[PDB]
Amino acid sequence: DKRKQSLYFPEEMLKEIQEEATRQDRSLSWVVQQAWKIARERIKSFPA
Amino acid sequence: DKRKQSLYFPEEMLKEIQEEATRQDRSLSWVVQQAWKIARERIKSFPA
């Protein structure tokens, strides 16, 4: 069940994401979702 | 240099991100940025 969310990126980073989106013929949202799925565990281990 | 971007997430996923943001006393944007920085390489290796 989908939900819209405005985020802030550095220029360089947004362009990096869009490059992967067009390379893979994907939405921005889908690439960022895959980044989360990959990183979740490593991030959930960050401290305080 | 910052830039605003609307993305779409599943409910569950947005809530997972916000949980890490408040746990770490961070913005949503900052957590998602860290997810990208972690996953970039693995994603840049995806195919077609």
Residue numbers in the entry:
A (entry chain A), B (entry chain A): 5 to 52
Lines from the paper:
We obtained two crystal forms of full-length CdbA-His6. The first structure (traced residues 5–52) verified that CdbA is a RHH superfamily member, with crystallographic symmetry generating a classical RHH dimer. In CdbA, the exposed face of the β-strand projects residues K8, S10 and Y12, while L11 and F13 are facing the hydrophobic core of the dimer. The β-strand is terminated by P14, leading into α-helix1 (residues 16-28), followed by a loop and then α-helix2 (residues 32–48), with a strongly kinked region at A43/R44, and a C-terminal tail traceable to A52. The two α2 helices run antiparallel, with kink residues I42 and A43 packing against their counterparts in the opposing chain. Successful model building of the first form allowed us to solve the second form via molecular replacement. Upon solving this crystal form, we realized that a similar, but more loosely-packed, tetramer can be observed when considering the crystal symmetry of form one. The tetramer interface displays different hydrophobic packing between the two crystal forms we observed here, suggesting that it may have inherent plasticity that allows it to undergo this change.
We show that CdbA is a tetrameric ribbon-helix-helix DNA binding protein and changes conformation upon c-di-GMP binding. Consistently, c-di-GMP and DNA binding are mutually exclusive. In vivo CdbA is essential, while CdbB is not, and depletion of CdbA causes defects in chromosome organization and segregation resulting in defects in cell division. CdbA is abundant and binds globally to the M. xanthus chromosome. These observations are in agreement with a model whereby CdbA is a ligand-regulated nucleoid-associated protein (NAP) important for chromosome organization and segregation and in which CdbA activity is modulated by c-di-GMP.
